[PDB]
């Protein structure tokens, strides 16, 4: 039952520098199934135990590929499933991605 | 939590057009011109 101060101190040490998309679920194995190359992402300062990316991210999905999930790297620190899978070639737009302790 | 969202892909461009121009003109110092009637002449006073 951490207080807001503990959550803010904790989140200040997360430094996810890049993101990668996966067609297979990367939670079991985040090293394989790379769909797109690493793309830099930027994160804001913690507030009320939450952080979010400061700006939009654009990713080039290769030909005849599909995207299902994502994984953060800096080593890997997090993974998650996209709001909806999409069979495109094109540009996939990722809005703010938030990490929370609430 | 870890959450993701989606946004609309936006692109910008600069399209502009141009045409160019040219001019021409041809002539020469005239002599006699052209006349349908052309015959020997005598001019009295």
Beta carbons of A2 and A9 less than 8 angstroms apart:
no
Cβ A82–B4 below 8 Å, yes or no?
A: yes
Q: What is the resolution of this structure in A?
A: 3.1
- Beta-carbon pairs below 8 A across chains A and B: 43
Cβ A98–B3 below 8 Å, yes or no?
A: yes
Distance (Å) from the alpha carbon of A99 to chain B's nearest alpha carbon: 5
Please compute, for residue A75, the number of CA atoms within 13 A of its CA located in the half-sphere on the CB side: 6
Q: Which helix H or strand E contains B3, and what residues bound it?
A: strand B2-3
- The span from the CA of A39 to the CA of A55, in Å, is 13
| Tokens standing for residue B27 | 């002539």
Beta carbons of A94 and B5 less than 8 angstroms apart:
yes
Beta carbons of A22 and A71 less than 8 angstroms apart:
yes
Strands, DSSP E only, in chain A? Answer: 18-22, 39-40, 50-52, 57-61, 66-73, 76-87, 90-94, 98-100
Distance (Å) from the alpha carbon of B1 to chain A's nearest alpha carbon: 5
User: Which method was it determined by?
Assistant: cryo-EM
Would strands A66-73 and A18-22 be described as parallel, antiparallel, or unpaired?
A: antiparallel
B2 touches chain A (CB under 8 A): yes
């Amino acid at each position: 039952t951490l207080t807001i101060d503990g959550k803010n101190k904790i989140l200040a040490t997360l430094t996810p520098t890049t993101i990668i998309l996966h067609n297979v679920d990367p939670t079991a194995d985040p090293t394989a199934n790379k769909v797109t190359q690493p793309v830099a992402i930027y994160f804001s300062e913690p507030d009320n135990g939450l952080i979010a990316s400061e700006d939009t991210v654009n990713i080039t999905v290769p030909a005849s590929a599909t995207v299902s999930h994502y994984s953060l790297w800096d080593k890997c620190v997090a993974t998650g499933a996209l709001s909806k899978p999409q069979f495109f070639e094109g540009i996939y737009v990722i809005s703010s991605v938030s990490v929370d302790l609430n | 939590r870890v959450h993701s969202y989606r946004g609309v892909l936006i692109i910008t461009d600069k399209l502009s057009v141009e045409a160019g121009s040219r001019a021409s003109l041809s002539g020469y110092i005239s002599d006699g011109g052209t006349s349908d009637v052309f015959t020997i002449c005598r001019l009295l006073d």
